[PDB]
């Protein structure tokens, strides 16, 4: 037995990092994490505050602060994300989940 994780991105259009970066044109001044790191780690900006979603697993995160690693938060909250696993690797995700 065992269902399989689907391969289709939640938002295929936001699969381009370049386009993900564009969405952070209004990423707030009181925000504390750089758009480039966020966009690199699969996230694009939604709304007018500091909410982001991953283009693939659609994991939603907000309340970002100075020192938050987008790749680490990605692995903390959405470990089965296929974009995350292909980018950072099995060992990286396992490491964040254990600790
Ligand atoms: Zn994801």
Report residue 81: phi and psi, to 5°: -55, 125
Range of the domain at 23: 1-99
> CA 2 to CA 17: how far, in whole Å?
32
Task: Say how many Å lie between the CA of residue 93 and the centre of ligand 1.
Answer: 12
Tokens of 93: 């995700």
Name the residue with tokens 């269902």.
3
* Ordered DSSP codes for 62-94: ----TT--HHHHHHHH-TT-HHHHHHH-HHHHH
Task: Say how many Å lie between the CA of residue 58 and the centre of ligand 1.
Answer: 6
Please give the resolution of this entry in Å, rounded to 1 decimal. 2.3
Number of domains in the chain: 1
For residues 37-65, b (16+ Cβ closer than 10 Å) or e, as one string?
A: ebbebbbbbeeeebebbbbbbebebeebe
* 48 assigned binding-site residue: no
Task: Say how many Å lie between the CA of residue 43 and the centre of ligand 1.
Answer: 8
> CA 33 to CA 14: how far, in whole Å?
20
Q: List residues, by chain if needed, whose CB lies under 5 Å from ion ligand 1.
A: 42, 54, 56-57, 59, 78, 81
Contact (CB, 8 A) for 50 and 43: no
Q: What is the DSSP letter of 96?
A: H
What CATH number should be reported for the domain holding residue 63? Answer: 1.10.1170.10
Report residue 50: phi and psi, to 5°: -115, 30
């Amino acid at each position: 037995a065992g269902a399989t994780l689907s391969r289709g991105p939640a938002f295929p259009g936001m699969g381009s990092e370049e386009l993900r970066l564009a969405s952070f044109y209004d990423w707030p001044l009181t925000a504390e994490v750089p758009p480039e790191l966020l966009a690199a780690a699969g996230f694009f900006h939604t709304g007018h505050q500091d909410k982001v979603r991953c283009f693939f697993c659609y994991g939603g995160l907000q309340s970002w602060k100075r020192g938050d690693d987008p790749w680490t938060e990605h692995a903390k909250w959405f470990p089965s994300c296929q974009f995350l696993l292909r980018s950072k690797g099995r060992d990286f995700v396992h490491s964040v989940q254990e600790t």
